[PDB]
């Protein structure tokens, strides 16, 4: 008993290294996507998913935001090893739990 959680809040992105399982540019809006930017869960901020799908296929959309866990690991400021590493290692098989808590508009 469950329901598919859509983006705009706590969204997770799962893909199995098959066709795509990543495709985002990190540190673009942030210093390294995941972190603990300023919350109690983490806080990945990015450009998000590539234009040609990829992570977008992984369904890891949202440029600049706050993740609870990345690649499955809770990036509550862990990054260094876990979160940042996942950004770089993403794809093999990625599972992400994100928490939508942006501020500015979708462009402004």
Swiss-Prot record:
Tyrosine phosphatase which negatively regulates FAS-induced apoptosis and NGFR-mediated pro-apoptotic signaling. May regulate phosphoinositide 3-kinase (PI3K) signaling through dephosphorylation of PIK3R2. Residues 12-101 form the PDZ domain. It comes from Homo sapiens (Human). Expressed in keratinocytes (at protein level). Present in most tissues with the exception of the liver and skeletal muscle. Most abundant in lung, kidney and fetal brain. It is found in: Cytoplasm, Cytoskeleton; Nucleus; Cell projection, Lamellipodium. Belongs to the protein-tyrosine phosphatase family. Non-receptor class subfamily. Interacts (via the first PDZ domain) with PLEKHA1 and PLEKHA2. Interacts (via the second PDZ domain) with TNFRSF6 (Fas receptor) (via C-terminus). Interacts (via the second PDZ domain) with TRIP6 (via the third LIM domain and C-terminus). Interacts (via the third PDZ domain) with NGFR (via C-terminal SVP motif) and PKN2 (via C-terminus). Interacts (via the second or fourth PDZ domains) with PDLIM4 (via C-terminus only or via combined C-terminus and LIM domain, but not LIM domain only). Found in a complex with PDLIM4 and TRIP6. The chain holds residues 1357 to 1459 of 2485 of the full protein. This is Tyrosine-protein phosphatase non-receptor type 13. It comes from the Eukaryota.
């Amino acid at each position: 008993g469950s329901s598919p959680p859509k983006p705009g809040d706590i969204f997770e992105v799962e893909l199995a290294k098959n066709d795509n399982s990543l495709g985002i540019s990190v540190t673009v809006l942030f210093d390294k996507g995941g972190v603990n930017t300023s919350v109690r869960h983490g806080g990945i901020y990015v450009k998000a998913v590539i234009p040609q799908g990829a992570a977008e296929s992984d369904g890891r959309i949202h440029k600049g935001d706050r993740v609870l866990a990345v690649n499955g690991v809770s990036l509550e400021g862990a990054t260094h090893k876990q979160a940042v590493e996942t950004l770089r290692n993403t794809g093999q098989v990625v599972h992400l739990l994100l928490e939508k808590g942006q501020s500015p508009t979708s462009k402004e």
